[PDB]
């Protein structure tokens, strides 16, 4: 009963992560797609398929800043997380809906930030885990070699650890980034804990599936 969502030259991954090339509605009956501008930073999108089906038809859809960029991250650098793999108008950039956190000075203190769903609907939260190419990269970016990441809620629980290795160069990158996503129930808290390697949510999406 509603017009479709046209993603033009983008696919769903690039649109929803906010690939700078990918620039609205609150409702659509299906998504029209093409598969090139998706994840400009190479890596894997975990359970990508379920996210497509989950996004195919929606009745309510609002982007909101789950973690304000200038207010959420006092102990870390929220400015340096840009790359040539993700360019925006001739400049190095990054997903609009994520922030690549990076050490401040020469230490990466523990990160612990939470959010409680005060929207009256399911909230879609995305994030990434960065996987550096060398153990030297791991230190320059994150300081800590034993970096870990935990993400929890009432329905989601998972600890992440970086796998350091030399991949073949994709978009000149030897490192990799994995992308995750989960749904946060209307009364639910989501917690983030990290000693590095965490690509942080900035925008998330309040929604209703059809």
């Amino acid at each position, epitope marked *: 009963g509603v017009a479709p969502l046209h993603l033009g030259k983008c696919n769903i991954a690039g649109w929803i992560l906010g690939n700078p090339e990918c620039e609205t509605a609150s409702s659509w009956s299906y998504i029209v797609e093409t598969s090139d501008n998706g994840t400009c930073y190479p890596g894997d999108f975990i359970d990508y398929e379920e996210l497509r089906e989950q996004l195919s038809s929606v009745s309510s859809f609002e982007r909101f800043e789950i973690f304000p960029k200038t207010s959420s991250w006092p102990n870390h650098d929220s400015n340096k997380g840009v*790359t040539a793999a993700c360019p925006h108008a*001739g400049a190095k950039s990054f997903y609009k809906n994520l922030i690549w956190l990076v050490k401040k000075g020469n230490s990466y203190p523990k990160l612990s930030k939470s959010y409680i769903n005060d929207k009256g609907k399911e909230v879609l939260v995305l994030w990434g885990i960065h996987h550096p190419s060398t153990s030297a*990269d791991q230190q*320059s970016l994150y300081q800590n070699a034993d970096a870990y990441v935990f993400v929890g809620s009432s329905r989601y629980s998972k600890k992440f650890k970086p796998e350091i290795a030399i991949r073949p160069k994709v978009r*000149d*990158q030897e490192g990799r980034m994995n992308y995750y996503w989960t749904l946060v129930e209307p009364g639910d808290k989501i917690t983030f804990e990290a000693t590095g390697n965490l690509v942080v949510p900035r925008y998330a999406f309040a929604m209703e599936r059809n």
Partner: antibody
Amino acid sequence: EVQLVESGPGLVKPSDILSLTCAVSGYSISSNYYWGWIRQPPGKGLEWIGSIYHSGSTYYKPSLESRLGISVDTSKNQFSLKLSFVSAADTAVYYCARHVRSGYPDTAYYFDKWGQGTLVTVSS
Amino acid sequence: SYVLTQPPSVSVAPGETARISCGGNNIGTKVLHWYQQTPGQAPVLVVYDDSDRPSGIPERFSGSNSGNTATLTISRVEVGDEADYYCQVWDISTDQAVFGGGTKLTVLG
């Protein structure tokens, strides 16, 4: 506090090998840095040559790669340059320099500590 | 190989502001570093990671990489600032460091 000093012959015949060593003092190469070479012909600009990590990984200027070797000797806290089959185009002041990894995500290096340099003339 | 282009020369009266540009295709996608070299000496790092200053470098030296030439800006120029200035990037597609051709700063008056 970290110092680097280049040494080796100041005169080399064409078709021979140019050899240099950089002795580092005040800091151990076996540490999170790359170590490399930049040269400057007299009165001209700087040209980067190559670099090495204590593990042995190297980066070479593509135009020179066929004639270049770089080695490291952690036990003496030094590294060395070998440039083969030289001609007059290789006459330059040679600098060694510590290569610092950019804090940005993408691979990038810059040179924060430099030796004073050594002149090598290639001539018959 | 990646090419960096600098103007050969900039002149400025003492106390005024000198600006040195560094052009390259999509240079905004690379990080830039800048070096100062005084007659007879080794180059000295003055700016790294586009816009950061090493310890000990006067606040007068700043760098930028917005628009699409990057720029070394030197405020309140002093005669002691006469030197050749070089920009430098790392090219990730070919795994090498590249320098611009250098700019000579002259102080007038």
